[PDB]
PDB file of C-alpha atoms and ligand atoms in Angstrom:
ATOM      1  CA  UNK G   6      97.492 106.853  83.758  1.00  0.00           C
ATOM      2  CA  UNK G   7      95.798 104.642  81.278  1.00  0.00           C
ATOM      3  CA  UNK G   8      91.931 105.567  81.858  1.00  0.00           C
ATOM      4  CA  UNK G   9      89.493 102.056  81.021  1.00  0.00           C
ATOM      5  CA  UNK G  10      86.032 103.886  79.596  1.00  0.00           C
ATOM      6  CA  UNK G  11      84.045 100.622  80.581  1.00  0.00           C
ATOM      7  CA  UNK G  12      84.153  97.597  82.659  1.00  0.00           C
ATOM      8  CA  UNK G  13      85.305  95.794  79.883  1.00  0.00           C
ATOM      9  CA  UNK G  14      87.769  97.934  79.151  1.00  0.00           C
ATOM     10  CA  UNK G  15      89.464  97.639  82.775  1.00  0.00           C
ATOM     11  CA  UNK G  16      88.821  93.934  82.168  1.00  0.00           C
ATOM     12  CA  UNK G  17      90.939  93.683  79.261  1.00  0.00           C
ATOM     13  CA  UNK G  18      93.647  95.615  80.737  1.00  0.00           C
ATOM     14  CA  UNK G  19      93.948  93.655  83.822  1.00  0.00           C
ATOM     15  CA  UNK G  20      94.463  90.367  81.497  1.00  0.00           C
ATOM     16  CA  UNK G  21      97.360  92.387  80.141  1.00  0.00           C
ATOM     17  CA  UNK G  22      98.831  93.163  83.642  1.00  0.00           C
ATOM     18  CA  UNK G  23      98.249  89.947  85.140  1.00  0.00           C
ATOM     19  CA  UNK G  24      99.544  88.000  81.681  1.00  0.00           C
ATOM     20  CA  UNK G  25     103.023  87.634  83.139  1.00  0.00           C
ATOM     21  CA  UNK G  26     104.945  86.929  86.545  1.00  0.00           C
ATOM     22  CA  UNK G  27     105.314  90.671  87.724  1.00  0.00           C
ATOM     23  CA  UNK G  28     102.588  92.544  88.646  1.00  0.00           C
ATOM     24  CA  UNK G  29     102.776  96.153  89.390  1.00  0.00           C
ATOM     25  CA  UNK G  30     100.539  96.757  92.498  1.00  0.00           C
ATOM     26  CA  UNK G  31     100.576 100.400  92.526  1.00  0.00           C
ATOM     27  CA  UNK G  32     100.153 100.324  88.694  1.00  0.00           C
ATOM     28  CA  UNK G  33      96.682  98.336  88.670  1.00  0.00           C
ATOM     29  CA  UNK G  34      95.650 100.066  91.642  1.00  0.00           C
ATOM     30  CA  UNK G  35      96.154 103.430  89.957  1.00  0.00           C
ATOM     31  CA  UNK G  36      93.744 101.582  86.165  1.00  0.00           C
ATOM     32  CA  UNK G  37      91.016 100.412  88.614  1.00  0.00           C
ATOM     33  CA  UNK G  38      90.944 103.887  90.602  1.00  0.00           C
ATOM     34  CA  UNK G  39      90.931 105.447  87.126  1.00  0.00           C
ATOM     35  CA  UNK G  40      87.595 103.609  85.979  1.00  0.00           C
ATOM     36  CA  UNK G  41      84.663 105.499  86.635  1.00  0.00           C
ATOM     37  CA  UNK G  42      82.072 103.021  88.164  1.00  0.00           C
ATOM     38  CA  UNK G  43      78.767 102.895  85.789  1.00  0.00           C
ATOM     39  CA  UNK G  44      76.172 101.166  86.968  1.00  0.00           C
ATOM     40  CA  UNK G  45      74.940 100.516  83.664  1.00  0.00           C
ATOM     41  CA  UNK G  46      78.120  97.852  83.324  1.00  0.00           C
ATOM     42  CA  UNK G  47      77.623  96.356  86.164  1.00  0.00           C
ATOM     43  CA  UNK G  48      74.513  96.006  87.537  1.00  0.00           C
ATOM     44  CA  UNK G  49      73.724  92.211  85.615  1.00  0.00           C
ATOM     45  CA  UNK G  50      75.714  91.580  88.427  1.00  0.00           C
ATOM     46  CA  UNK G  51      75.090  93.860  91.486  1.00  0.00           C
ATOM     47  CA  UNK G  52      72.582  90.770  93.376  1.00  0.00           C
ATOM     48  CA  UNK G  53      71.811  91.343  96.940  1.00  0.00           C
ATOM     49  CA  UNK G  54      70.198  89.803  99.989  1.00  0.00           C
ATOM     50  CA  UNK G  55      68.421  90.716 103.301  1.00  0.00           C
ATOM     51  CA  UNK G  56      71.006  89.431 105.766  1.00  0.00           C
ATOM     52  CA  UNK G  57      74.515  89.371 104.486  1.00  0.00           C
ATOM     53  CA  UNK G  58      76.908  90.533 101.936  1.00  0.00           C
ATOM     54  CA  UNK G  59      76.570  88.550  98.566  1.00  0.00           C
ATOM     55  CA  UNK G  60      79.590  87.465  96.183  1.00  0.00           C
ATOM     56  CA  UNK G  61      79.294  87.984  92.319  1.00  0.00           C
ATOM     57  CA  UNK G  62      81.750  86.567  90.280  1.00  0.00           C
ATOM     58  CA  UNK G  63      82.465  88.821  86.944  1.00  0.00           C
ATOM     59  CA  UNK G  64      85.556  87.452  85.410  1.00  0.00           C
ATOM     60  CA  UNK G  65      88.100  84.431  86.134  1.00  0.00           C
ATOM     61  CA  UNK G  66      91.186  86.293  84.575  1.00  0.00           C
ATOM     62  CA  UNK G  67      92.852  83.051  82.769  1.00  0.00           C
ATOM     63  CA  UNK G  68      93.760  81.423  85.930  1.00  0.00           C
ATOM     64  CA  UNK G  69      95.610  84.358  87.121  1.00  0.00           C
ATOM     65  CA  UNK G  70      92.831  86.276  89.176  1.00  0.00           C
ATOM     66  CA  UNK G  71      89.344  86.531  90.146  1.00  0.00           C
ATOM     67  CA  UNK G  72      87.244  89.805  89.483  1.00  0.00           C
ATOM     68  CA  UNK G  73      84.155  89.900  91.572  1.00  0.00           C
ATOM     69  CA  UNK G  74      81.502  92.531  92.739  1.00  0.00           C
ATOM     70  CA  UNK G  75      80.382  92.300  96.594  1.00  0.00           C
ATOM     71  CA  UNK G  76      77.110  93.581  97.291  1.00  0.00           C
ATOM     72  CA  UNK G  77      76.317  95.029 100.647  1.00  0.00           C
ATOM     73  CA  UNK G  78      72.933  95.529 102.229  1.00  0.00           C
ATOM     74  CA  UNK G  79      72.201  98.678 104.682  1.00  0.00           C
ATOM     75  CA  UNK G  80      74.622  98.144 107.545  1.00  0.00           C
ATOM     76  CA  UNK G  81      76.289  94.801 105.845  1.00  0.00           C
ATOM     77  CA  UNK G  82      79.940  94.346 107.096  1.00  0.00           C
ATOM     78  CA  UNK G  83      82.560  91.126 107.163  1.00  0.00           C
ATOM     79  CA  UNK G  84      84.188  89.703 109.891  1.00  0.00           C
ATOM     80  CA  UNK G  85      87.816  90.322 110.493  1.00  0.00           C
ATOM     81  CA  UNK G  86      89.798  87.854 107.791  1.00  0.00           C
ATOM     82  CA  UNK G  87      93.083  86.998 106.038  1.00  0.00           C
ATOM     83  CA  UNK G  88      93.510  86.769 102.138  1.00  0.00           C
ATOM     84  CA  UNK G  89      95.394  83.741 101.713  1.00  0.00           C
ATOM     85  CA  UNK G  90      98.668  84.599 100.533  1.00  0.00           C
ATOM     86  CA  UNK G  91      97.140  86.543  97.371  1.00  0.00           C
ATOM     87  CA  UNK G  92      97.649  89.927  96.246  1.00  0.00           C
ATOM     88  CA  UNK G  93      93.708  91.851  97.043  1.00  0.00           C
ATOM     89  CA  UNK G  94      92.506  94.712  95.391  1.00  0.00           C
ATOM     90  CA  UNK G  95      89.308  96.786  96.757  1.00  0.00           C
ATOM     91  CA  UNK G  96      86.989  99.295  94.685  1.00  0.00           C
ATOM     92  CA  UNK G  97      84.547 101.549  95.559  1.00  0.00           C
ATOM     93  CA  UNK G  98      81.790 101.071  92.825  1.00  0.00           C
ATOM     94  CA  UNK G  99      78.719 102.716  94.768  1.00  0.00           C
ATOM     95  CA  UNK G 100      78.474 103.789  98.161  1.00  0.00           C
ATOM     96  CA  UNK G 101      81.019 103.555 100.873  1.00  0.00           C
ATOM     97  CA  UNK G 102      82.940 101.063 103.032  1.00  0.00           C
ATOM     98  CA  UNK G 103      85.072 101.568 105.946  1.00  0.00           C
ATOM     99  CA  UNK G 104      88.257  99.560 106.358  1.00  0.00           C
ATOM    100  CA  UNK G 105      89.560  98.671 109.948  1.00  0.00           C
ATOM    101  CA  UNK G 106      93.007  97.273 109.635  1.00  0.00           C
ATOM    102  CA  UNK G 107      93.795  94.900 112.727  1.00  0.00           C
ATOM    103  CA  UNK G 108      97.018  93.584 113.662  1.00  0.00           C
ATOM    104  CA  UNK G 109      98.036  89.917 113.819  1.00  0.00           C
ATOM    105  CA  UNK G 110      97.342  87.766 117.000  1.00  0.00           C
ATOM    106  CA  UNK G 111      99.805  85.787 119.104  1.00  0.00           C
ATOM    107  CA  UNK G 112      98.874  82.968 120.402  1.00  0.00           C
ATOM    108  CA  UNK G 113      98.142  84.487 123.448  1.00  0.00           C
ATOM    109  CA  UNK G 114      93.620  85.429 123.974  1.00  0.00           C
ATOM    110  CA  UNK G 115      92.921  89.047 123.840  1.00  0.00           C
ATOM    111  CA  UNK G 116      91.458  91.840 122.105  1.00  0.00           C
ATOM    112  CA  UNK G 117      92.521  92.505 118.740  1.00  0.00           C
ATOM    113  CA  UNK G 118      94.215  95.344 118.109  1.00  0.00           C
ATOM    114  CA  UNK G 119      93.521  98.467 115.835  1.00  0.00           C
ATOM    115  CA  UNK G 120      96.147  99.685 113.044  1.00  0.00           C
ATOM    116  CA  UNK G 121      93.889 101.794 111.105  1.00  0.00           C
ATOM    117  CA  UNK G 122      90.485 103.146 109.948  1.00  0.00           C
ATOM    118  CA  UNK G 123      89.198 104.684 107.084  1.00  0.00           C
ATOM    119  CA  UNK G 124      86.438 105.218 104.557  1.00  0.00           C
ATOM    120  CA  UNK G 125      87.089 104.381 101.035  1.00  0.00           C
ATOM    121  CA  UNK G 126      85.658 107.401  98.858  1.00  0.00           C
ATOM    122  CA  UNK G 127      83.226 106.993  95.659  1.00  0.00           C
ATOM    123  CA  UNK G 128      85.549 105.125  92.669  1.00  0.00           C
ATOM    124  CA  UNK G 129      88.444 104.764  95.074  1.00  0.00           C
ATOM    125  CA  UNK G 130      90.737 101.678  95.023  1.00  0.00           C
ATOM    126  CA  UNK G 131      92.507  99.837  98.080  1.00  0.00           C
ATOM    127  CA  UNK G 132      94.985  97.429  98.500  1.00  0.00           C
ATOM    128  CA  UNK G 133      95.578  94.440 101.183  1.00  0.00           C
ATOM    129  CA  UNK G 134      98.061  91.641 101.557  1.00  0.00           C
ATOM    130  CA  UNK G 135      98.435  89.426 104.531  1.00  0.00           C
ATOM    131  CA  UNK G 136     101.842  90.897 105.232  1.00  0.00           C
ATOM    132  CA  UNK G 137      99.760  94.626 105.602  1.00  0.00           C
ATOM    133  CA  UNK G 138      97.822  92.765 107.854  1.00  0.00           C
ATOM    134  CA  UNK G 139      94.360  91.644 108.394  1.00  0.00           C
ATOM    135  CA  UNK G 140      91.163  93.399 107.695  1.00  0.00           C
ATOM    136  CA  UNK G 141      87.268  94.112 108.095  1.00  0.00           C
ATOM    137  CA  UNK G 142      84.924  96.366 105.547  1.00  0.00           C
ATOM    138  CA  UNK G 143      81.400  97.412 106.364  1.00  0.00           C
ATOM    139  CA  UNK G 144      78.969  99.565 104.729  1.00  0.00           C
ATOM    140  CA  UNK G 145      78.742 102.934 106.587  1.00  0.00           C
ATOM    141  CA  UNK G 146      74.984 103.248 106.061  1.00  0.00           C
ATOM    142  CA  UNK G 147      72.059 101.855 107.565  1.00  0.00           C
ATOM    143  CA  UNK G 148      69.862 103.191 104.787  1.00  0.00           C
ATOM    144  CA  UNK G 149      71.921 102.877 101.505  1.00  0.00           C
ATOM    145  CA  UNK G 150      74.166  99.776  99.839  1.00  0.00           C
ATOM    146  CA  UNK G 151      77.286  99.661  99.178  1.00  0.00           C
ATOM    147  CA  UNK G 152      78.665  97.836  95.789  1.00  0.00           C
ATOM    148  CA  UNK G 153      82.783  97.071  95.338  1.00  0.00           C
ATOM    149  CA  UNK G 154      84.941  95.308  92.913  1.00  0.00           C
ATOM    150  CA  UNK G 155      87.372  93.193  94.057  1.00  0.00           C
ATOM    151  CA  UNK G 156      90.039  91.363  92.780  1.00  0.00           C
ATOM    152  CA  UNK G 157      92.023  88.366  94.349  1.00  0.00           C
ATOM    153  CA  UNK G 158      95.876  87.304  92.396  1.00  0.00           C
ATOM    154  CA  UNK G 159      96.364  83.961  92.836  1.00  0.00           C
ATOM    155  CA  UNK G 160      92.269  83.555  93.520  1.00  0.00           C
ATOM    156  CA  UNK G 161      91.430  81.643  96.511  1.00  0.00           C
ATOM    157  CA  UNK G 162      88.123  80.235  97.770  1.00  0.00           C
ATOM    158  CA  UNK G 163      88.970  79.938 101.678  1.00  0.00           C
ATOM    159  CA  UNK G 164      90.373  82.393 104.303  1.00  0.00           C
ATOM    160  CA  UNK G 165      90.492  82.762 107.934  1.00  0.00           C
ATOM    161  CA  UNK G 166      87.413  84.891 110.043  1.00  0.00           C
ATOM    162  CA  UNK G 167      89.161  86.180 113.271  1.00  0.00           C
ATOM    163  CA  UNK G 168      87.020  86.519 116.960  1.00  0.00           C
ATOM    164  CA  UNK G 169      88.081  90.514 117.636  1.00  0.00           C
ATOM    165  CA  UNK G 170      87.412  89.440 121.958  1.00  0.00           C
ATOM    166  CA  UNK G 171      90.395  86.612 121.655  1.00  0.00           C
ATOM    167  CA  UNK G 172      92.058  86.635 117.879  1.00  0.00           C
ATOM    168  CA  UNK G 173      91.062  82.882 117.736  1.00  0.00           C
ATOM    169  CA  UNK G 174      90.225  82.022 113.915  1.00  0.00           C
ATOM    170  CA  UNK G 175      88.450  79.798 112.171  1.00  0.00           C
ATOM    171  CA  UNK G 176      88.621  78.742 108.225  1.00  0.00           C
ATOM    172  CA  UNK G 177      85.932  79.933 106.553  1.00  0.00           C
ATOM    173  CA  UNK G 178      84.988  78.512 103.049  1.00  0.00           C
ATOM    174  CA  UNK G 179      83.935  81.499 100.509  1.00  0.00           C
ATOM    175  CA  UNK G 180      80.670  80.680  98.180  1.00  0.00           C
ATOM    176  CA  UNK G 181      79.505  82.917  95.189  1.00  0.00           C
ATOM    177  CA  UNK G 182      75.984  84.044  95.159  1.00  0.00           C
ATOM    178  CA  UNK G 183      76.423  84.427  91.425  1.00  0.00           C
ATOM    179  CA  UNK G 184      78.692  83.712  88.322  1.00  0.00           C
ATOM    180  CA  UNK G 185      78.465  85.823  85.459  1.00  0.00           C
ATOM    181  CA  UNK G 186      75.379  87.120  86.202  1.00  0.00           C
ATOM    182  CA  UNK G 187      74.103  84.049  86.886  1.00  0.00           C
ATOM    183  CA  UNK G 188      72.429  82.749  90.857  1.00  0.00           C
ATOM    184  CA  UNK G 189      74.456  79.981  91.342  1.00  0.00           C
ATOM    185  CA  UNK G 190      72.358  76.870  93.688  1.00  0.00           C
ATOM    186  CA  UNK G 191      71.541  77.930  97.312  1.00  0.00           C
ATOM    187  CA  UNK G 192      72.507  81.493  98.000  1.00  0.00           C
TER     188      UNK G 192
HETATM  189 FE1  FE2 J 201      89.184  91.434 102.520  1.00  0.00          FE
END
């Protein structure tokens, strides 16, 4: 496996891989698992707040991707949500999420249904599409954060949150707290 040394490193790599029409998910998985998170590279853009998860975009992957770091406060989680049609890639960076996969609704009301749970281990990297099925992350802790790295092929900037009581959804419309390091207006 071809081991990135630094954030930029992986960066670089991942504008190889993504440079074509193919990508190899089990192949970029495996380069992203093999980076060993530093928070030294990436804490310019580690920005948090009191009451929700925060977005942080890093890198906009010539069209092909976006490469973000989510920040989540003590006890921080998402709803239950889609990806859009787009390839998503999930890594552990500091701290540690767990992943409930949920099955699909019908368009019948009623509780949403469990496929799997898990926690995501220090550096590890997982992978969602909507045909896997849909998905919820929260930070395990009440008393530590949680930092991942994330990265969306094609990128996308709205999704679907999902009501676990009925499976009704609503679109949601994704913001970035920050771009490059830099707040962007109005959290
Ligand atoms: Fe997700």
């Amino acid at each position: 496996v071809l081991k990135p040394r630094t954030l930029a490193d992986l960066i670089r790599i991942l504008h190889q891989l993504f440079a074509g029409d193919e990508v190899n998910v089990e192949e970029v998985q495996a380069i992203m698992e093999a980076y060993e998170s530093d928070p030294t590279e990436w804490a310019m853009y580690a920005k948090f707040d009191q009451y929700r998860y925060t977005r942080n975009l890093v890198d906009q992957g010539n069209g092909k991707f976006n490469l973000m770091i989510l920040c989540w406060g003590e006890g921080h989680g998402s709803s239950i949500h889609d990806h859009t049609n787009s390839h998503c890639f999930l890594k552990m960076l500091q701290g540690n999420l767990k992943e409930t996969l949920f099955a699909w609704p019908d368009k019948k009301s009623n509780e949403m249904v469990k496929k799997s749970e898990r926690v995501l281990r220090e550096n590890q990297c997982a992978y969602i599409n909507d045909s896997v099925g849909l998905h919820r992350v929260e930070n395990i802790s009440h008393t530590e954060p949680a930092v991942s790295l994330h990265l969306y092929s094609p990128p996308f900037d709205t999704c679907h949150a999902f009501d676990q009581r009925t499976g009704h959804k609503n679109k949601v419309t994704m913001t970035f707290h920050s771009k490059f390091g830099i707040r962007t207006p109005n959290a």
